[PDB]
Amino acid sequence: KDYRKKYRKYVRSRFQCIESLNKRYTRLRLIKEPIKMELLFDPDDEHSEPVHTVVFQGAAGIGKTILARKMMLDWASGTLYQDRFDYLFYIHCREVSLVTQRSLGDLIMSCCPDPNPPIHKIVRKPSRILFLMDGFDELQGAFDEHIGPLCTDWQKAERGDILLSSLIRKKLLPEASLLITTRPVALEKLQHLLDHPRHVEILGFSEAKRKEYFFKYFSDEAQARAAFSLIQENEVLFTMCFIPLVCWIVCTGLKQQMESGKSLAQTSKTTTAVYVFFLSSLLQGLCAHLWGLCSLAADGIWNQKILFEESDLRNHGLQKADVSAFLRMNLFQKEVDCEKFYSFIHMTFQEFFAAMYYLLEEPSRDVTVLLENYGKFEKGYLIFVVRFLFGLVNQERTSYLEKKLSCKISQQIRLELLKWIEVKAKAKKLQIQPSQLELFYCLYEMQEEDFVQRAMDYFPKIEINLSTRMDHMVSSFCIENCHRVESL
Ligand SMILES: Nc1ncnc2c1ncn2[C@@H]1O[C@H](COP(=O)(O)OP(=O)(O)O)[C@@H](O)[C@H]1O
Ligand SMILES: Cc1cc2ccc(-c3nnc(N[C@@H]4CCCN(C)C4)cc3C)nc2[nH]1
């Protein structure tokens, strides 16, 4: 009752996101599988009982964390679920340990600012509690559908996985509501726990909300109009910029380019080119400390570590003053509340530095054992580590950041990636690790006509499910680059 006011006051301040949240927040697209946020838990024309679990699936960098943090802010402001919920607990999945034996009560007290919250007054009305589980795919370690026995005691301390699994399966607080956000890769795992979920898909910015971001970002109109014109003139960038992280990256790259007397131009055609163009803006240190940055990201992927403490990055080379050269330029950030923990600006940037590690001119650098771990939740699926390898390996493509890669080892990786394509194409009897469309996403990043032409001849037929204009772009490139032993 009176504590709800104290918790709401805390949620109002901690979710300010001054990395205002509102000052940059742009309307994200949400579709049921046109949904009004307030009626997410309201049952449909058929159901009489309300929805208890709602699943937000969306792209990497689409803004799942920003939507969760916006919901938290709007709720504590009064706007959202004023009469539907009394408590909204934000569970940052990357911070939750899958092995750490903890109770559901312990978890709720992590979301509380005070040391002694009234945990019994809080779980008094479970139906009035909504668990905002952010980043299910970001749960470090293996999340198995076989873990057990399940939990039905909120006070009982069970293994992190058993605890989260029991909450998802609605075994723990059955009438408490749940909002799980995740990339669609991990939806295979999540589907096996969900008790009648209502699926929703985050589809980034609309064609109008794309322009809107460019105008909330650029305080000047003459800057905003010119930066959006660069996106309109570029077919690939325009398509890519529905993803808000892509908008942030492009605007920040063009902002650094604007700082100099350099006429606006981004001739980027691949996701790898977008990340290499962005990183090259920050290269004025990130040249001598490139070995550390890549080894830290690779070690943090092989053993599932998003948050690296002071001791992780100290042993990796980057000292106390090097981390300041990465924080101010926007490459490293302080997370895990007011504690000395440093994680990458995004999981896609960690997967980028993990991919770059294998290509630096000198964990292990065996792409063979890296590719064997592809498609596993316990390793982060490695979707982007492989994609960035395909793009960086690109021989007929070089910038400043690409010139610091061994041309001898990037050729060996090129031949290894082509064998991996041949293996996946022929033995299609897999319960999906690299889908046929995902293999088209890998060949798109590659871009080289000598490689894509050879890699395309392995596929017997084209069987893919096109969903976004990106799917029909990436796969059309591969179809155009595929031609038989005598087609004509
Ligand atoms: N609606 C939005 N408005 C403004 N920026 C956004 C929005 N959604 C995402 N972002 C940008 O994307 C970045 C990462 O997105 P995030 O919400 O963490 O997505 P995900 O969890 O799907 O990777 C944010 O730090 C921010 O720069
Ligand atoms: C910041 C940022 C850059 C970026 C570039 C591409 C994508 C992306 N990648 N793959 C998609 N769908 C395929 C479908 C087949 C299976 N594979 C694994 C997934 C869809 C999207 C939007 N997300 C991105 N985020």
Swiss-Prot record:
Stated consequence of mutating Q191 to A/R:
Does not affect ability to activate the NLRP3 inflammasome
What keyword terms does UniProt attach to this protein?
Activator, ADP-ribosylation, Amyloidosis, ATP-binding, Cytoplasm, Cytoskeleton, Deafness, Disease variant, Disulfide bond, Endoplasmic reticulum, Golgi apparatus, Hydrolase, Immunity, Inflammasome, Inflammatory response, Innate immunity, Isopeptide bond, Leucine-rich repeat, Lipoprotein, Membrane, Mitochondrion, Non-syndromic deafness, Nucleotide-binding, Nucleus, Palmitate, Phosphoprotein, Repeat, Secreted, Transcription, Transcription regulation, Ubl conjugation
Consequence recorded when altering Y10R:
Decreased ability to activate the NLRP3 inflammasome
**What tissue specificity does the UniProt entry give?**
Predominantly expressed in macrophages. Also expressed in dendritic cells, B- and T-cells (at protein level). Expressed in LPS-treated granulocytes, but not in resting cells (at protein level). Expression in monocytes is very weak (at protein level). Expressed in stratified non-keratinizing squamous epithelium, including oral, esophageal and ectocervical mucosa and in the Hassall's corpuscles in the thymus. Also, detected in the stratified epithelium covering the bladder and ureter (transitional mucosa) (at protein level). Expressed in lung epithelial cells (at protein level).
Q: Where in the cell is it found?
A: Cytoplasm, Cytosol; Inflammasome; Cytoplasm, Cytoskeleton, Microtubule organizing center; Golgi apparatus membrane
Q: Which residues cross the membrane?
A: none
Which residues does this entry mark as bearing Phosphoserine? S20, S97, S127, S166
Q: What is the effect of changing Y25F?
A: Decreased phosphorylation by BTK
Top-level taxon of the source organism: Eukaryota
Q: What is the effect of changing L139P?
A: In FCAS1 and MWS
Effect the entry attributes to changing Q191A? Decreased interaction with HSPA8/HSC70 and NLRP3 degradation by the chaperone-mediated autophagy pathway
Q: Where is this motif: KFERQ-like motif 2?
A: 412-416
Give the protein's biological function. Answer: Sensor component of the NLRP3 inflammasome, which mediates inflammasome activation in response to defects in membrane integrity, leading to secretion of inflammatory cytokines IL1B and IL18 and pyroptosis. In response to pathogens and other damage-associated signals that affect the integrity of membranes, initiates the formation of the inflammasome polymeric complex composed of NLRP3, CASP1 and PYCARD/ASC. Independently of inflammasome activation, regulates the differentiation of T helper 2 (Th2) cells and has a role in Th2 cell-dependent asthma and tumor growth. During Th2 differentiation, required for optimal IRF4 binding to IL4 promoter and for IRF4-dependent IL4 transcription. Binds to the consensus DNA sequence 5'-GRRGGNRGAG-3'. May also participate in the transcription of IL5, IL13, GATA3, CCR3, CCR4 and MAF.
Its family remark reads: Belongs to the NLRP family.
How it assembles, according to the record, is: Sensor component of NLRP3 inflammasomes; inflammasomes are supramolecular complexes that assemble in the cytosol in response to pathogens and other damage-associated signals and play critical roles in innate immunity and inflammation. The core of NLRP3 inflammasomes consists of a signal sensor component (NLRP3), an adapter (PYCARD/ASC), which recruits an effector pro-inflammatory caspase (CASP1 and, possibly, CASP4 and CASP5). Homodecamer; inactive NLRP3 forms homodecameric double-ring cages that hide pyrin domains within NACHT-LRR rings to avoid premature activation. (Microbial infection) Interacts with SARS coronavirus-2/SARS-CoV-2 N protein; the interaction is direct and promotes the binding of NLRP3 with PYCARD/ASC and facilitates NLRP3 inflammasome assembly. This interaction disrupts the association between NLRP3 and ABHD8, enhancing NLRP3 stability, ultimately leading to increased inflammasome activation.
What name has this protein been given in UniProt? NACHT, LRR and PYD domains-containing protein 3
Interval of the full protein contained in this chain: 134 to 679 of 1036
